[PDB]
């Protein structure tokens, strides 16, 4: 049956619930209190064919940082849980996706060793109300709990929304590849 | 008994109440009308083991500047009052604390001569709704009324929230050291 | 009697009322819909000893630009009206004022020829909700309708609020000097 | 009556007595054990029309530093005391004075917030037996206890005695302006 | 009683056993098949007062890399286990230690978030038979499984053995501080 | 009982007597014929809680060099003697202390191998009558006879007296730490 991982975590700052199906149909059901992040999690579901269910609340009066971080941490853990024994999967993923003028290359390995390589240069400080420093932190936190090797390379781009969104498209497609069955490893 | 300092000050712009216990247990009770500052004052309490009670209101319609300044001024005065005759204390504090990639070295002396040395380079203009120029002004104002020699050195950091928060962790730990009894000066 | 100038102007975008007494006592009564500008107009009154009455409404949904501009234009006209025949006045003003680390030199002549020389470098984009580009535009518009020669020189400064506020202090003091009676020109 | 401030302070290192009349006639009566400093305090009295009475002794065997510092601290306190409630005064001062080729601009505000901006470049290490590093320290210490905002800008100069002396002339004249009654604030 | 963590892990490449006592007496009992690493683990025990028991074998015919990595991973896990609920500890550590001309500053937080900041510049490729690239990898792997925030700053140094050994001295002393009881958090 | 070291040495150039108590109460009793050095030795006693008794005479007609050197040599020997078998001590010390704008980091190890790392940049040639080249020589000579590893790093500073004095404060505090009992090495 489908590989599903679920995490619930409450702290004094945030409360987060995540459920991810690696064998999904792109069902997008994310509400973090951070609308731009919800849009990116929808991208993860649609471009990766994951089913993504996220609920979070938190101390957004301070800033979006703790919520963003705790959502990412929980997603990484949910991915780890869903992966189970990791038998028979491709393990590696590699994809370069555009959004108009933006072009982002993502390469990853479900290695069990956390590492983020990241060189995005996002030229504005806010996309809507979303602090663009939080993009790197989202991926770093996700890597840290999932135990993923992840490289994100900005090949082109000028519009901040395009850069970030193309990153999520490429990541989702690379992660779909990595999590799928390898037909010669059954 | 415990060294407690209290200040109340009302101006045409702000109204501030501060009570600080140098011999506290980290009781955090700060409401300034500036949520990010409240978070940093919680850090001061938790990392310093001060009991910190702050209430402020002010002209935040203009910007957070007058409130931030008047809170800092009052805290410096409250620290001065709490210190009393300053007998038997370590006087000096020195600590370097991280928050992830950020690393901040704080050195201080409860000297009676105000000085701020500060080289933070905070790469974004807003953390939540908090103007990052206000960090330096908070420490400068606090130094001016407390009569503290304070040096803040940014050794590493990229995320603005991490840089500022690590600064408060390091400051709190250095100030705890300085305010504690020196076992050989009794 | 006192030199008073009054202007009312309604356009499709803004509605502005200004009354200025050159021989005032620093009565501050400004409500523009732009809180930071209200604070600066209070500075004008208090540091210049002008009585300043301003009411404005406008299309702040778009941005503060049209309101800021129309307020400034009306103030310049009100100053011109109040000056009347300009007999017996000092005409020239010259003052350098600080606000903490900021230091601003203003020199002006009530010449009848508009000119703004301005070299402020305001290092952040927003003070509260006030767009810092609007400072230069305020002075330019005021100069244009008053027919003033005005030079503003930033000698020092780092905090944007301090830079802008010191500018208004220096301007107010220079304008007080220029508008006052010359004891040898009666 | 005249605004007079008096300070006496004895430490293990120095003994200092200061009496300053803000409403003086330039009576110069300074003996610090540092002859060049006595000359500068005479300049303060003569160019500011303060009456300045200073007596100091100290550990000049070590160097002039502690004496210079403690004299400056006491002067700042005496100024603060003499100012009293600060009602009706100009508050701000601004003057540029030469001594031959030297030209020094001083701007100050009796603000209650200490700040020194200082860019003198004194090209020799000793004027007589006076260590030229002590000039900055004199002004810094004075600012710290008086709660003054003070900016000192070297516009020209080559001879060290001229640079330092012009600074005291300009400071004295700016401080006279700041401390005098504002005829419209009675 | 004493906080002890134990890890055993066998892979196709290496076999590692670690037992660490956080409340030790500096008992040094390390045999990794990598003599220079054994020397550094002795330093960890002696300078940290940890009891350190390590046994490892592995594919040193290929190079020391897999053994070094797997030892480090296991040590990080053993530290995590030994820490237990982490109640009442200092949590943060900060120390700068020399070895002759080498001087290394280590700052760490037992945060639960892995991060390594590292700027060593080791000027030779081999210390004995030990590949000096393996130093960074040892700390990175240890951080990854322990969930430690760790910064290592080379302040001075020329001799590779001195640089690496001073790093272990400083790390051990910082980790001792972090793991010890905070007398005010009981 | 208290760890006391005493040295007497007469040469054709100087005559020096030193007695140091590592377990002192900050008793300061130094007379070298070099007043600035006496002030620094008082700092050593007060900031380190050493009891420091020094008497020296010498050929100060030539310059202060031989006296300064011979005092330092004797102090290093006295420290070595007082340390005795060096059992149970912390051995390492690490502290960063300010004096106003100056900030100096000292790290040391009572290693038995002499080394001085020193990067002070003292911007004037004389503090009082004390030749500022003699600061480095004092520490070098002390290191050479004590067998100490000592690093002195200037992090900030402009006033020569402040730079040198902060160095002695930091050194004294680091040396107090190194010489004190380690509670876990009894
Ligand atoms: O690539 P998708 O099919 O998910 O479509 C993306 C949308 O165009 C949208 O999110 C967008 C287009 N430009 C910025 N954002
Ligand atoms: O160090 P603390 O125990 O006070 O925890 C701090 C929190 O992690 C939090 O304030 C934070 C983490 N990243 C940004 N902020
Ligand atoms: O100079 P004033 O007496 O008008 O006082 C100004 C206030 O201190 C205030 O507007 C301010 C201080 N720092 C930023 N703003
Ligand atoms: O300007 P004053 O009237 O006080 O006269 C100053 C003197 O000329 C004197 O102090 C001087 C001239 N050159 C260096 N010093
Ligand atoms: O600092 P320790 O007491 O552990 O002694 C270290 C030894 O001197 C030694 O490991 C060494 C000295 N130079 C390189 N290595
Ligand atoms: O830090 P201490 O308590 O020893 O006080 C030092 C004195 O202020 C003094 O030595 C000094 C202050 N500025 C230069 N020297
Ligand atoms: Mn974070
Ligand atoms: Mn989109
Ligand atoms: Mn301010
Ligand atoms: Mn935080
Ligand atoms: Mn316009
Ligand atoms: Mn203001
Ligand atoms: Mn000083
Ligand atoms: Mn002269
Ligand atoms: Mn590897
Ligand atoms: Mn060795
Ligand atoms: Mn010599
Ligand atoms: Mn001194």
Author numbering:
A (entry chain A), B (entry chain A), C (entry chain A), D (entry chain A), E (entry chain A), F (entry chain A): 9 to 194
Please quote the paper that reports this structure:
Imidazoleglycerol-phosphate dehydratase (IGPD) catalyzes the Mn(II)-dependent dehydration of imidazoleglycerol phosphate (IGP) to 3-(1H-imidazol-4-yl)-2-oxopropyl dihydrogen phosphate during biosynthesis of histidine. The metalloenzyme imidazoleglycerol-phosphate dehydratase (IGPD) (EC 4.2.1.19) has been identified as a potential herbicide target due to its essential role in histidine biosynthesis (Ames, 1957; Hilton et al., 1965). Since the substrate lacks a carbonyl or imine adjacent to the leaving proton, which is thus non-acidic, IGPD uses an unusual mechanism for catalysis that is distinct from other dehydration reactions that have been reported to date (Glynn et al., 2005).
To study substrate binding in IGPD, we used site-directed mutagenesis to produce an inactive mutant of A. thaliana IGPD2 by replacing E21, a putative acid-base catalyst, with a glutamine residue. E21Q IGPD2 was co-crystallized with substrate to yield a 1.12 Å resolution structure of the enzyme-substrate complex, termed form A. In contrast to Mn1, the second manganese ion, Mn2, is five-coordinate, sharing the same four protein ligands (E77, H145, H73, and H170) and one water ligand (HOH1) with those seen in the holoenzyme structure. However, the position of the imidazole-N3 nitrogen atom of the substrate is such that it would be too close to that of HOH2, the sixth Mn2 ligand in the holoenzyme. This potential steric clash in the form A complex is avoided by the prior displacement of HOH2 from the enzyme. The substrate imidazole-N3 nitrogen atom forms a hydrogen bond to HOH1, which in turn is hydrogen bonded to two conserved carboxyl groups (E77 and D108). This arrangement implies that the imidazole ring is neutral, with its N3 nitrogen atom protonated and acting as a hydrogen bond donor, consistent with its high pKa (∼14.5) for deprotonation. The structure of form A therefore shows that IGPD links the binding of its substrate to the generation of a ligand-depleted, five-coordinate Mn(II) ion at the heart of the active site. The form A complex demonstrates how the open form of the enzyme can capture the neutral imidazole form of IGP.
